[PDB]
Amino acid sequence: MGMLEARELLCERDERTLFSGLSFTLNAGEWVQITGSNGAGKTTLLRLLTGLSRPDAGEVLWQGQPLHQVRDSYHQNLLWIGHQPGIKTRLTALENLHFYHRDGDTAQCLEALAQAGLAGFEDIPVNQLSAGQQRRVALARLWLTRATLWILDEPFTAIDVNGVDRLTQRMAQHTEQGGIVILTTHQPLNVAESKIRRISLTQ
Amino acid sequence: MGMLEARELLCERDERTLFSGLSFTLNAGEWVQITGSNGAGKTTLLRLLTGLSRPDAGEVLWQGQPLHQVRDSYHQNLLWIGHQPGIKTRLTALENLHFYHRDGDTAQCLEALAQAGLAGFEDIPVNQLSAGQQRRVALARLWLTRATLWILDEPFTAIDVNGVDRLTQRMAQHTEQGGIVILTTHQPLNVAESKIRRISLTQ
Amino acid sequence: NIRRKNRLWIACAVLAGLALTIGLVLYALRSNIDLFYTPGEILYGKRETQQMPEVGQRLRVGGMVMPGSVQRDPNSLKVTFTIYDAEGSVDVSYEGILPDLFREGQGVVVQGELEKGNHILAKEVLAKHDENYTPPEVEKAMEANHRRPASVYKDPAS
Amino acid sequence: MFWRIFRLELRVAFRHSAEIANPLWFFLIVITLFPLSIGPEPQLLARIAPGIIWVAALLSSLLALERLFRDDLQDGSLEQLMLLPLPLPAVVLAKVMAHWMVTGLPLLILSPLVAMLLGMDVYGWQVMALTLLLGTPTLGFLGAPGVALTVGLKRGGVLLSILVLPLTIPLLIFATAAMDAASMHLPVDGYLAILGALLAGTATLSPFATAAALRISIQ
Amino acid sequence: MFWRIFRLELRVAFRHSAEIANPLWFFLIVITLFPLSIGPEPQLLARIAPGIIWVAALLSSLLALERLFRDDLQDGSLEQLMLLPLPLPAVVLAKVMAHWMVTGLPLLILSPLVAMLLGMDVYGWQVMALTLLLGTPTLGFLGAPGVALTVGLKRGGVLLSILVLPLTIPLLIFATAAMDAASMHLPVDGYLAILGALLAGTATLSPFATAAALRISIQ
Amino acid sequence: KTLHQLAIPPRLYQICGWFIPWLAIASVVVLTVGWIWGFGFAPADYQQGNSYRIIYLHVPAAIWSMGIYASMAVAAFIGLVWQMKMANLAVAAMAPIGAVFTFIALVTGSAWGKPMWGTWWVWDARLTSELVLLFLYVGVIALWHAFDDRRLAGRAAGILVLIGVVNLPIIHYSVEWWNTLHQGSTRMQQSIDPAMRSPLRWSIFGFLLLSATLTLMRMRNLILLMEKRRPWVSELILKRG
Amino acid sequence: KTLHQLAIPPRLYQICGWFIPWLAIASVVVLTVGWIWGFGFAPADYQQGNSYRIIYLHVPAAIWSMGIYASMAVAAFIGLVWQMKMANLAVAAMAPIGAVFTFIALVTGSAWGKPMWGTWWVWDARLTSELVLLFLYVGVIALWHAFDDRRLAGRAAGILVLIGVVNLPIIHYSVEWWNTLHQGSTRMQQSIDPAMRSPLRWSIFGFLLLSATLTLMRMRNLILLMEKRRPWVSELILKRG
Amino acid sequence: TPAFASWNEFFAMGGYAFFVWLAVVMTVIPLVVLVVHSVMQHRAILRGVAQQRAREARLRAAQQQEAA
Amino acid sequence: TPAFASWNEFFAMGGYAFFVWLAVVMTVIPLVVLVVHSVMQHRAILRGVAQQRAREARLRAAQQQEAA
């Protein structure tokens, strides 16, 4: 079986029925990409799979158990990046990345922040950085994290092209060892159609 | 002479020099478009051109006089639509559009809201409307204004192609007589290159 | 598993917090420790529980100083004075300096040990800044028994 | 076009009427706070009622002050209101007058109830209502710079108070001195004359120092 | 991991240090306001000093409550703290403990100045400092449900007070009764014991009902 | 069983629809007979005189002012464990009725306190406790209005209802202890001379029925608020005519 | 002329760098002479005895704590009309100095009033006015430190400086009338015997020089803070060594 | 069986009549206000659904015109 | 010419010795705090510029590595 299974998720944001009856199961090691049309609602879908938002109907399942029970094991195996990067602007990049697990020693720190494209901007405060480079510390959290589930709410926003190729290379590397990445992106992505899978939240 | 003219506009948002030395003069009946490369900084140019934001050095002129003196005549000939629509979500669409000048009687009301695509949604409160339909009230202001100068931070954000076609047709109709529209948009727009003019804020 | 470990640890914190809450509530309700009696509550027992004060227990007595009951030993700090409510009267013996606030016809509170015959060996006497203040229990004692004069509760031996 | 802004602000405030009552419920809770601490003794409460009433009034207006400009930044209305063909002093004057008709008139109609709660007589209520009527406009005009600058901040809840209340100290002294000269029966014309003088001065000077304040706060 | 959240919140608060003083400056504002209204009379000020001290404490902590959760909503850090591998009651407990170390400790070190300002003796300062130490954590734990409920609102400044203050009424009554007994030179052990009882009860129950509200507001 | 079908919104709408009229008529009869047997055809207390009939207009208005809040707690509890949205709607349904009952109890208590104390408001423990209860009701109503989404507003209201019920016995006993010291109080609310007892009990039961009627009808109001688009309302309104 | 060259931020940096040492040493000389010829080599008041020396430590700490604020207005005025940014940095430069001078004035007033009044803090008009002045300084400083952009922080600080300066005579005369109504005061600030007057004036001028030195140095601190990237600080730091 | 012998005396409840009748009016008014608001709200929501569905029928007629 | 005849009596100003020296000390301290704060602020801004421009030199080194 697959760990993440969505069963009959129904969501109404401000009494607008965003999607109905949507149910998809994910086995180990696929790279589902949400390909919906409206701007808001695929973000609500990702918040619905992460457990930020409760289903108004139906349920999200992680390893056979509902999300209201298995929180301490589900949150051990997830990495969520929203439209907001989820970091503190007041601290520097290195302490913000050190808040998240490990970092510290050079085996897990100062190359993870380098492979996002932030080599040499490690000790600068975040509030004196460009918005894409602010997203790149949370985007640099990928290279140090052991979570099998990654969920991404526009990862490639204000990101230069070489950054996107490096992120997709590390991301497919995660896809190899049974890691699942669920993401939404606007841009047409340069990966072969054979590997990916598309779930569309139609209407 | 041209009415809207910019002289050595430099802006430093949070000590980042987005642009310096930009100077451009706009004769009547032109539909210049702000190309830009960064997401924020062309919006700063538009707010700087309407006079919300002062130039840090250099100056903007309307009809040969600086903007700190001629406000009462400048604001009578301008229509500004930012990323935020500028309308109140508490009031109805018709009353929000009636706050702005004229409207009221049927010579300036109930087709202006119709040609933007909000036919049949006139009396519904704004907070029970989709975000594109929220922006289309401010977009519907175009058919009733007398302002020669229109300035637009992303007018075509979540409007369908028919609404974009209608907006560009009305905009070209404004361009035929004496009047400047300045706009910023992501989408490649469907008007011939000979008519338009591009000022790009180079880095 | 990890779920059981987390629930058990935070539940141990919960029961420790509730136990300390109940402990401080019951302590404070016991830390009222109402050794505050009136002379009527010495002679005839407390109004609610009818419990007598025992000989030798440390205790506190609110009462008005009688006019003419304060005789001071001229060669020592020894002062004997009788204090009353509008229900009874008890003798007080105090060795030490009296407060400057101590006048006849004013309310004082006596901390001391009870001897035989309703007699109190004071270890401390607290006289208040307010000349006309009566303690709440003593004030209710005189509101219940309707302001009988101090000469009436001067025990006629005194 | 000074009146259309005022009528529109009244329509927005009256379209959801419940939020208007929250300043007066905060006022009533602050009146509730000091009897519970000091005590139910009526002579002390009657003596101290001016201080309770005005600390409650300052804080109620000051927390109500966020709706004066915080709504229009996110909706984008405020930029357009500067780009009406009208000097922005008049726009600020219309907003502060609408805010007083939205925040201060609830206090002026709640005035009998808080006068009942604190033991004041009919003369005390008359002076209390006249003094609130001459004071809460001044509260709006002194708080308009504070809201004007602290509208762009994420953390503008304590800083707004820090700027506003030292400005409103003279109103405190004159209002509670009028109230002390009202509790003991002496005429109170001179104190209300000084209150009106401050109201006129701050109404004259606050739009002109709030307009440039609101131009800085957003650019 | 519970201590890492607390230590990081302390680091973010101590990075810009100036902003943590604004609660105590507002506390001094509210300290100042009453004797301007009442008068410089020292016996009345000495008797009313519990009322000023604790109404100032409630309002200062209440206005400081915005920094407890409003920052992490816009930065997105609040979500990432909720999907940390740790039950969200502990995350709430870490944030409220850091908030008390950042809002209540300034009041506790500021306590000599206010004790000398109004006129209480050294026993008065002792009782008031112990009572602040046992009370301002309870301010944090009763304010956390209100902030967790009102973090999604744009206008959440008056209503947060409206929710928090009736919850803090019992702490008000026991604190001012404690220092009223202290001004008469009575032992205040029982009042502090009830105070610690309320501290333990709210500290036990408040994370579990703030976590549900915090899950409610974000979705 | 039918308890599971009770959570279906149209089915609850017709359950409330046929429960309003009978219950309301019964309420009117019981409360009417209660007041007419209490205000006349009954003695008056010897010391306070004929000002004792106010003990009706206060005491069903007082106890149920707590009682509704206690019932609100029950609804809020059903909001959090079984995640039933309609109990969180019942919290918002029953908050204004509790607020109005609290207002009646407070200011009728003031009207009773004038012929004894001489002032409209001597800060008695009962009136202070009801004032704090009114502030709790206003907090619940303000949370229910401030939020935009009705479902989220009801769930937030349920959170604060459980908070208020957790902290409410503390408030009541702290206020009672607040007038243990700082003077005392007389025996007024439930010191009742016999044979002036059945009218007060019957008025209590009548106020219970009126609270149930208003609760059951604002239930329908909020149901029509939330489900303004789904076709069961459409069939109901095309049935209207 | 050269006043227009007093606008270029590096040139202002070496002007302040050249004015720091000489003015600082003149300040220390004048203040040392003032205190050494005031706290000794000087008579004492008859009624106060030897506690009158505090009139030094208070009165330059008082007047200049007003005067800096007055000078602040001038800078703020230059910030609003001609839109000079360096004046708006001058406002933030003098704001901590004014706050510290005001706090010193408060502390010396309290330590002076203890041997008279018996307590540390009697709500005298002068000390309350100084406390409100300190609150306005804290408002300006927190305004300058809550913003992100420094230029807009300085312009905002200038706006509240002008507001405070307009409202300051009203505050001072209202507080003076507040002490007129309730209870009077003694002759404390400037009721001074001859031959003890020159030390007070010398300390006045010394505190003026020290305030000018601190202002002229924090001006460099703020100028270095904003121009942290332009090449002139690069040339200065490569000159350092 | 009535305690008050005269029906006119029942309107003047032993001198303490102003407080009692003030309170009777002051409890009758808000309960009436709650019932009036609770009836008018239901009627208003039903009529608002009526206007919304008339506008929806207008929408379907416009769709029919677009189809035709 | 000193009013105080004894130099030891100078430190004990006529019984009122605590208040004068208390305000002398608590005036000397905040001026030292201001001077130290501003001097270390100037040094800290200069050293921060030094670290930033050394890091800019490392950026130049990285650009030279990319060019080579």
Author numbering:
A (entry chain A), B (entry chain a): 1 to 203
C (entry chain E): 2 to 159
D (entry chain b), E (entry chain B): 2 to 220
F (entry chain C), G (entry chain c): 3 to 243
H (entry chain D), I (entry chain d): 2 to 69
What did the published study say regarding this structure?
In our cryo-EM single particle data of the native complex, the two most highly resolved 3D classes contained the Ccm(ABCD)2 complex, but one of these additionally featured a prominent periplasmic domain that after refinement was modeled as CcmE with its N-terminal transmembrane helix. This helix interacted exclusively with helix hVI of CcmB, with the periplasmic domain of CcmE poised above the CcmBC interface on one side of the complex. Although the observed interface was small, the interaction of CcmB with CcmE was well resolved in the maps. 29 % of all particles used for the final refinement contained CcmE, and although at lower contour levels a second copy of the chaperone on the opposite side of the complex was apparent and the N-terminal helix of CcmE was visible in lower-resolution reconstructions during data processing, the relevant class predominantly contained a single copy of CcmE, with slightly lower local resolution and presumably substoichiometric occupancy. The transmembrane helix of CcmE was modeled from residue N2 to S32 and is followed by a short, flexible hinge preceding the β-barrel domain that commences at F37. The heme-coordinating residues H130 and Y134 faced the membrane but were situated above CcmB rather than CcmC. The association of CcmE to the complex also did not seem to affect its structure, and there was no discernible change observed in CcmB. In the experimental structure, the periplasmic domain of CcmE showed enhanced mobility and a lower local resolution than the core complex, which in the absence of a bound heme group is not surprising. AlphaFold2 yielded a model of a symmetric Ccm(ABCDE)2 complex with a root-mean-squared deviation from the experimental structure of 3.1 Å for all atoms that also reproduced the observed association of CcmE to the heterooctameric core very well. However, the periplasmic domain of CcmE was rotated by about 90° towards CcmC, placing it above loop 5 and the WxWD motif of the latter.
